[PDB]
């Protein structure tokens, strides 16, 4: 996150990260046994961590699980990111408590100009590099999808929005892909692309969450 601030400790309890060694993408908690990530962030061999803050330190309140099972968005395409979507089931279901909570999916989609709270352990500076070991969290709102698909010519589905400030200076960026865009208490985006990061007219990009639930519930319902 470029230009945000610290969340504080287990703020944004759903947040989760995806560890294969190391951190290297977000993900949400939508039930106790189930988290959405970007289809981008796939790979095998998963642990999800529930309940941090430092993502370096034991702090006390984590809980490390094993993915079973992951599911790709079946018209996932790796070129282009469109429907960057997965599912990632728990080999034991999350003990769900203050610091480790689902967050709700939409009902509908959300409004332009709607304020979403973004977060994540990525990249810091939007030239260089400096990662956090603490949550960041930055309010940005929904952007007309004018403003998206005149930022990003020919790039643009139905299935992404923008969010951010087309001047620059906020922004998600490397390392928050996957974790959640949350906007009147709904998961409505999940980080997926941009041009670099808190680039002037460049937001970035989000996988609009309200295009997938029914998919969502009916592969968790089956698996
Ligand atoms: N600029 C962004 N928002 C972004 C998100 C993932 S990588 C870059
Ligand atoms: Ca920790």
């Known amino acids: 996150i470029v230009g945000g601030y610290t969340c504080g400790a287990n703020t944004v309890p759903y947040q989760v990260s995806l560890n294969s060694g190391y951190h290297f993408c977000g993900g949400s908690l939508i039930n106790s046994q189930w988290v959405v990530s970007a289809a981008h962030c796939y790979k095998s061999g998963i642990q999800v961590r529930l309940g941090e803050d430092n993502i370096n330190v034991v702090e006390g309140n984590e809980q490390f699980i094993s993915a079973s099972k992951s599911i790709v968005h079946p018209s996932y395409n790796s070129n282009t990111l469109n429907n960057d979507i997965m599912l990632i089931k728990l080999k034991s279901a999350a003990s769900l408590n203050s610091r480790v909570a689902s967050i709700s999916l939409p009902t509908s989609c959300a409004s332009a100009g ?22 960041k969290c930055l309010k940005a709102p929904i952007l007309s999808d004018s403003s998206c698909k005149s930022a990003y010519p020919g790039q643009i589905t139905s299935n992404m929005f923008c969010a951010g400030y087309l001047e ?7 390392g928050d892909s996957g974790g959640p865009v949350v906007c009147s208490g709904k998961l409505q985006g999940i980080v997926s692309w941009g041009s670099g990061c808190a680039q002037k007219n460049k937001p970035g990009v989000y996988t609009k969450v309200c295009n997938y639930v029914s998919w969502i519930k009916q592969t968790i319902a089956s698996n």
């Not at 304020?115 to 590099?129: D, H, P, V, Y």
């Not at 620059?168 to 490397?174: E, L, P, R, T, Y």
């Open 114 to 135: 709607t304020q979403c709270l973004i977060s994540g352990w990525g990249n810091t500076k939007s030239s260089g590099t400096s990662y956090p070991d603490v949550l």
């Open 168 to 174: 620059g200076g906020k922004d998600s960026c490397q």
